[PDB]
Amino acid sequence: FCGSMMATGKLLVSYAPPGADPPKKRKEAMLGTHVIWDIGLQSSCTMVVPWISNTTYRQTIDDSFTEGGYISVFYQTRIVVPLSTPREMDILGFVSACNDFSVRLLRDTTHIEQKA
């Protein structure tokens, strides 16, 4: 959270394994794996998306059979600021693997190319 020290709030970060309607309301998101984050001195919050999948490994492309689910963020309460404080602010997100993460089957990437 990158707002002022004076800003407070509670947010809900959620992960819903696939196979159902993608959460579009807090009501649904609330049913899957989630962390309710309270904004304070400890400025950051981490939600672990547990390895929940049918296959032992997933495809590194968009694939239905090995789909991963949905991540979403909602307002638990709301952001509250006193007077003389910026009413809008930004949050930054970060992603990383856990100690149980692995990859396999080396292949070339589509992220770079040399035309001609």
Added chain:
Amino acid sequence: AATSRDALPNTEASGPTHSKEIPALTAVETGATNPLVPSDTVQTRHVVQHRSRSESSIESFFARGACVTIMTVDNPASTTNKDKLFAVWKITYKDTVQLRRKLEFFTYSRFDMELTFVVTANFTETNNGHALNQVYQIMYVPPGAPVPEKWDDYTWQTSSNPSIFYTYGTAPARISVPYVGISNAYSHFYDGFSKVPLKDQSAALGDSLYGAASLNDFGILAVRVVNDHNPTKVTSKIRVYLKPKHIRVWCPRPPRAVAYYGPGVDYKDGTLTPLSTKDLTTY
């Protein structure tokens, strides 16, 4: 401890009988097969059995390599307009019938795969031109990587995709691949869909093909002639042979009885009569 090459059980000598023991009578309703041996219904002598089932072990059953596809190339007049001289084939055994049927006696399998490539070439139009020995590039493009667009684009650099450069006239190329399935075993059959159609979604969005999943998406093999354009056209064919080694299989099934039709279990009209005519009381 019983090995595939061990001799089968000997036949024990047995004499006449007259008792309450009833080996002959059974009841198939139970779903069991009556485990009888000759000595249960006739008088038998002692026979030291030497035969073994060594040739019928799963490993030995799939010990032969088999064709899967015929990839081809082609050169035109000049360029004229064309420069898309390269073959791309989606790796799947379900293209032929021979290997496919053998791999259907079972529901699931695990195996290291050996692939051998036999490459042949030839001339087209009668000419006095002579081509120099060709080199071919067989590139495995795993699901995801960029597929070659032009015969001479970046993709052919192959910084991470395994590739085999085969020189014409040498022993056919060969490589091994470990069990690469995303599951604990490959699924020869999949009774289901890749997508669950949801009620609050459009039918189109929730639609998928019955029996198809990434369980069997292995990517593609892209093959091209490395040598530059020649004035005389040469056509080439690469035959791919697969031999499942170090194999294990689960759940037996009845073998396919009518002609295959697509990558599914579907059947075509007019191919539904595998049996011939024979009278009930004729030997």
Added chain:
Amino acid sequence: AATSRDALPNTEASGPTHSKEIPALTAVETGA
């Protein structure tokens, strides 16, 4: 001693919790 081909760490069974221990809360400012 950990080799490239060694199996990764097992997932340990864990139950409900209600304490002062706060794994979820952090501060990325530290650079960790």
Added chain:
Amino acid sequence: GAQVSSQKVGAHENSNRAYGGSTINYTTINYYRDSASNAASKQDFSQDPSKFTEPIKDVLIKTAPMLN
């Protein structure tokens, strides 16, 4: 690290001071790090067909009546 195994001899040459008799063995040495590269050993096991032939809950005794 050679693997020496025995062969099951079918046709025997008129020899027992080299071939035919005194157990014929064969050598195998693996050259690659990946197990997938190995040839097939063919030294396989068999099993009792019961899981398919007699999948009944209560054991089958052939001499007795199936239904009792």
Added chain:
Amino acid sequence: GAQVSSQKVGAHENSNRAYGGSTINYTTINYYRDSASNAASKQDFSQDPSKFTEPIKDVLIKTAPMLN
């Protein structure tokens, strides 16, 4: 001067009197004087990512508050 090492067996053949089970090894013999000529052993080590993940001076205890 042969180097015999073990393979990590993935798919196992129905064998435990040759393949699959009783540890499958592979042999390697270096033929050249220069080390640069050798093939890659692939028998590599891993390390704790801490030097990149937790480069902080005062040790991180996950259960405690990061800032205290």
Added chain:
Amino acid sequence: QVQLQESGGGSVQAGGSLRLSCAASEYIPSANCMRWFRQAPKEREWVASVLRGGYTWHADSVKGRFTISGDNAKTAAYLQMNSLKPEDTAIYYCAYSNTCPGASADFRSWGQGTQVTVSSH
């Protein structure tokens, strides 16, 4: 025998759009690579080639304007022709292949085709 049927052709002015369709009479359990071709004088020209899905190739003339799709179930293909030019005027055809992402005028049979006339102004 095996039959392919082209449809969707017509006459439009430049800059317009069309959508050509080619279906097989009955399903073909071999032909997975479909192609489009055209011609005006006395020489055939390759338009676009499309395998099962979703690898699609185009030509240095029709790319960006033309797009091929086709069902991964039904043996049929479709050609969406956008930003049409008077140069595109020709008879379009359809032909099944095997595992041939590449293209060459070397097909056994030939259906009938569908005329596309592009008006100028």
Added chain:
Amino acid sequence: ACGYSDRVLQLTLGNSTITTQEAANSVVAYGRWPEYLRDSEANPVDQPTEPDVAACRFYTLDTVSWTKESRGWWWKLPDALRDMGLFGQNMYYHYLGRSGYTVHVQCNASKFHQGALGVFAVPEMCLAGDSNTTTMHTSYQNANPGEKGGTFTGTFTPDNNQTSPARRFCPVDYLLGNGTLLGNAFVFPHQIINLRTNNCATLVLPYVNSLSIDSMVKHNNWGIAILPLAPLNFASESSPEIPITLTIAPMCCEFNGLRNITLPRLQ
């Protein structure tokens, strides 16, 4: 001694009990009794939900009618039980699920009737479609009929409406509906309900799949196929009828990845 028999059995699961006086023993498919997922074989990391007695109980599906013209019937698991009490619910709320089953097919008649039904449990029972223009095209809805199940047929009739295809299975009986000869089906775990002998079939099926756990809403592990090996006949009647009833009990079912409820398009 006490008179215990292969013919008389009592099965109890959860709050349900089934008795039978004319059984032909019972089958434990592939000799493997259903079991929960072992740690050594586990996959998803979250604590699984194990409903136990709430789901592990006998549910009776709708009864069908056997006549001289019946060609056969089929069902998919867990599909058939998709709407059965807590089992159904637990199924829809989770992304992953695994379950074994005790399938008990019931059909009685008289000492004067005759006929034989082959009850087969087929792992991955993929059935053939109805089109000669498109392969693998049967839709999700048609592929999953639920408790009513589907039926086999004696003649293949290709769907010719290319405008709006029916997109359904057209399973031919002698072809076991999948292009293999019926006479071989006996390779699958099975029992035969022969009227003169028994009035029920009992098949205990373990969870069988290429994965430890999988999506239940997308994929059916087992398929139950019931076909008349020998046709129904009674006295000298031209139109005899006897009902066939299925009762299925999930066993050792566990689920992972809880979320909001899946609401499938079933029609």
Added chain:
Amino acid sequence: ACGYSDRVLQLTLGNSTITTQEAANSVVAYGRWPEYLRDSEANPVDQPTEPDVAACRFYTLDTVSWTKESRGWWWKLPDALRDMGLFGQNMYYHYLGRSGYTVHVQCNASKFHQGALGVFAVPEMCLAGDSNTTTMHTSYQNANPGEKGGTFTGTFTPDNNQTSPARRFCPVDYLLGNGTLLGNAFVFPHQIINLRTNNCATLVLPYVNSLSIDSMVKHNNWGIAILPLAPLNFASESSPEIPITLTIAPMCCEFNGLRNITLPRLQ
């Protein structure tokens, strides 16, 4: 040493986690942590269903809005969670059920706002009706509002329509809605959310009833009452507003007597 605090807490149940940086410790009602039914205290004989992680997780009810004119709010348990995932389902499918709870009331503001909310958990929270012509007449529908809950009022207004009575509660705030003075409510397990101090209340409640297990659909064990002890005030604003959110997690819930699903008349 490591900086552990009464103010910073993390609660994890099932697949849900709640964090807080401004807590005021937490309350374990009557010093009793929730527990399953002991054999020595058991009643119904059938094997109970214990959903565990499927039901024992945090569910967030609809958020309400606190303003200068808010009189208070109320909810009933298990009523409020009647439609919450597997907990709701397990509740409707069984005749009997018992459950403990972790109730976490959330409401943040700023160092510039002021006010105090009393969060009370009342065993057997019977509320007074709205008629001066009939006693104990509030209908099932009105008695059970579900997740939306109800509200307290500052003035008693008797229902005068004797033709079609409203049949609802008319809970007067200072009377805690049951004819007892609010100032005494502190005898019930409670916490106070005073804006300057904390932004949440946490109450762990054991299953409390005169029986070991009871019908959940008919009877609510606990009642959650939230009333503003000190009214909301911000800066010099006439109409400040801050939201209040409830998240409740059933604990150690078990159910007996499975049947078909109860379909109550809720309207």
